[PDB]
Ligand binder design. Structure first.
Ligand code: K
Ligand code: K
Lengths: 6, 121
């Protein structure tokens, strides 16, 4: 449900 | 993802304290990155919520990829992250409900009921 931040 | 043609308020670090922190309004703020598939999916529902909530609840979005500082300030470790800013603008809670327009609006109204009932007491 989410894209990890960099 | 958003533009002047919608009711989503674009929130940069160059207006955040002003638009959000120093505001008596209930605020919903989406922290996103435009390359993130889960954030893209949410875009239409977010616009629908902002429009439904026009003049009732303020609805914002922060590109927390382009502005990672602000993203970091609120511990955003993923996109999209949705924060709700109630009475106390320094304890914004995280929304983990559905991502449909209706789910967002339902959460928005619940939080709003609380802000107003806080005002009353
Ligand atoms: K806009
Ligand atoms: K979005």
């Amino acid at each position: 449900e989410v894209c990890p931040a960099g | 993802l958003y533009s002047s043609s919608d009711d989503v308020i674009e929130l940069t670090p160059s207006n955040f304290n002003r638009e959000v922190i120093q505001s008596d309004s209930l605020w919903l703020v989406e922290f996103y990155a435009p390359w993130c598939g889960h954030a893209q999916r949410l875009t239409p529902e977010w616009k629908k919520a902002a429009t439904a909530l026009k003049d009732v609840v303020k609805v914002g979005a922060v590109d927390a990829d382009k502005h990672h500082s602000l993203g970091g300030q609120y511990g955003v470790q993923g996109f999209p992250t949705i924060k709700i800013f109630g009475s106390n603008k320094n304890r914004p809670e995280d929304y983990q409900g559905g991502r449909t327009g209706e789910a967002i609006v339902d959460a928005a109204l619940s939080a709003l009921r609380q802000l107003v009932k806080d005002r009353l007491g």
